[PDB]
Amino acid sequence: MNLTELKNTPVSELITLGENMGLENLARMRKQDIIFAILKQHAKSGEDIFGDGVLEILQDGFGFLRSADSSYLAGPDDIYVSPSQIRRFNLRTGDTISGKIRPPKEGERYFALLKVNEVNFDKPENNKILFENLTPLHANSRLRMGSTEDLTARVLDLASPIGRGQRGLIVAPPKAGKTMLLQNIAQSIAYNHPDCVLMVLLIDERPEEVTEMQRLVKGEVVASTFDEPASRHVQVAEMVIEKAKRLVEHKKDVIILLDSITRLARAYNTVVPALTGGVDANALHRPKRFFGAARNVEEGGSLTIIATALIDTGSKMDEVIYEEFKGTGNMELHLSRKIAEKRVFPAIDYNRSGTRKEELLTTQEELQKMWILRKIIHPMGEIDAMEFLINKLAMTKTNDDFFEMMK
Amino acid sequence: MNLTELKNTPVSELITLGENMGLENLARMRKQDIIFAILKQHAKSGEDIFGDGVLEILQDGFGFLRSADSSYLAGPDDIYVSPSQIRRFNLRTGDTISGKIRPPKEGERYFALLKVNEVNFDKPENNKILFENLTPLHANSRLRMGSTEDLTARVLDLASPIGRGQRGLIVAPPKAGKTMLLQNIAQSIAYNHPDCVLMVLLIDERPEEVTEMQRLVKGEVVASTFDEPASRHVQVAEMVIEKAKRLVEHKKDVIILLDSITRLARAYNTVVPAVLTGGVDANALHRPKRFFGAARNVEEGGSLTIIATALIDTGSKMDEVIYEEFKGTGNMELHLSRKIAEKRVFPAIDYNRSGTRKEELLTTQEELQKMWILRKIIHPMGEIDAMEFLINKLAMTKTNDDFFEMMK
């Protein structure tokens, strides 16, 4: 019917969709092959088979539309895109392309994009590239964050506010609520800021972890799992960032939530041609390139990346990578095992967190309100400081917390 | 008679049987060669011979029913399955195929599957692939575990709750009691969860070590010894995992106790072609990470739970790297300590490094609280001190008696 609608129906539903057409051996095939079979045996209409995907142009000059639902995993139901199709519309990889597709002529392997209907949600005939847009401190225009889930989001707003175009590092040791934090920021971005494109990127992950996120986030959730190779981790990431750049080129605000930059860096280290502690010096280039991408764009739009830096893992290499990303970001949230050990579960190291150019993300009144909060929480130890914030915040909502705790 | 019955009888019995069918010199034959003789010679009463095993589809398109009791080692007495029989039934490598079998005609080499009776213990024409079932966090159902054997099983239930579909990692140094721990979970699972399919998979093992395990475990014990090739270590593990996946596609709970994923990993590393990192091909850790990756709790029912040892402290650079690359992959981990072992305290569990993710899903709020209180009182305690204090406090009664008889 409609490829993406196909790619988004449950496997059983797809199976009984196939059998209703007369397709026999479907149950023992990969979801993609089932989709192919259904798409192929629906070759009975005239102008009625629609496709879409993010474009990936391989070195040999031809391209492939790949699907977000598959986290851009090369598959049988990839819509092929011709060199002469990329060239007629100045298409570059990352381009989200929509339109009519068609079965393979015999000798052909893949379904083919027949006519280009839409590029990047715009007329195919229509943009200055990301790399020559201007980079402001993306501190103007704040991304703000009843219930107790909103307690995390309220400490953040005081500890380390986020703007459109931030390059944030979530510095997280094991079991400190790194994931719940991300789920929270996601949920908060969805309710509060539905105007942004939300991309959650999961790199070296556990399969079950993946589907947990896929079921919470209102946005694009893309993932490779630890049982795919470094090549794939790299691929998935590089596919995401480009998609993000094309969308900024259209003056959108795009927000990537990255689970481990550090795992991503692992991948590049194994994938790149031939050290400081396991990790090649040349390797970190593309990771940094990726993080470096974040920016508020003067010409309009922004790309914001919040990435977790996994810390305290007993890996020399994880450590080296973190060292190597100090100073790159312009926000940090620090998570602490001590605060986690005790079950006090916002779990932020207040005195170690904070974003740069706070003043641009904030009304003058607020900033001064924040400075006294900081003045008072400063000498408190990690654990105290959180316990003190939760008891005082839970009484109210963010704003009235200061009025109330003045006199 | 029936192929499985024939190959589950002692060799002397088989020679006796065989001699008394007119079959000369075979006392010095390999058992399987003997089995082959007894079949080929029992080809008198036609339509009696039944056969079975796990299917491995080879590159050319035909397959072989291979048998768990030789740890899926290719043999004269493997049942040839035709390309057409695979196509007729949607058959897949890992399938458990029963039926009737027929002797080789002039110019073949194998008994052949002539009639298919059961496939995966269901009707031969009756299931969606592991790879597209959904993967909940493996905590919507628990697998719990007054003797001193049960000491281990209890200590385990407070440190590292296993649930249907866990990817557990047993990190162990040498002589730290990992084999006996393995044996203890095995016994705790059979006795306690007979509904779960238990497969114990041993890689690169000493021969007598195999036999010992083969005789304690109520369930499938497949192994490959250090005398067999890396290829063979790879073969056995791949056959076991595939069978596992196949049973989950039938809504069953399979459990794989895997001994030395690092060994499994060493095997792939020698078998996998060409970028080195401490001895080990980066490329190489893919297939083991895959083996482990498969552990999941399936949404549409059934589960694949996997518990694997990672060897550590062997003074092999390679073993260390393997362990690192698995750091993070699991959702339970039980650490063993040489420390606690040297001092002969046997349920030698580093309780403070052990634990599983999403505990809350494997326990009742009452249980979790009790457990969280236990963790508060153990945290500042050293490695050796902590088990002595846990054993001498469990050496009173059973599990709930622990807390109802500690809350003084």
Ligand SMILES: Nc1ncnc2c1ncn2[C@@H]1O[C@H](COP(=O)(O)OP(=O)(O)NP(=O)(O)O)[C@@H](O)[C@H]1O
């Ligand atoms: N905001 C919260 N409120 C209550 N409990 C929480 C909160 N955040 C995390 N936890 C819990 O602490 C646990 C461990 O969290 P988890 O999501 O595993 O952290 P993590 O940093 O993702 N772990 P890791 O996989 O090592 O990175 C949980 O099981 C939680 O329930």
Ligand SMILES: Nc1ncnc2c1ncn2[C@@H]1O[C@H](COP(=O)(O)OP(=O)(O)NP(=O)(O)O)[C@@H](O)[C@H]1O
């Ligand atoms: N629960 C227990 N009760 C009594 N003895 C135990 C127990 N667990 C381990 N041991 C003993 O510790 C010994 C060696 O244990 P074993 O299970 O062989 O270690 P291992 O982990 O298999 N070593 P290796 O295979 O070289 O890594 C014994 O000989 C034991 O008796």
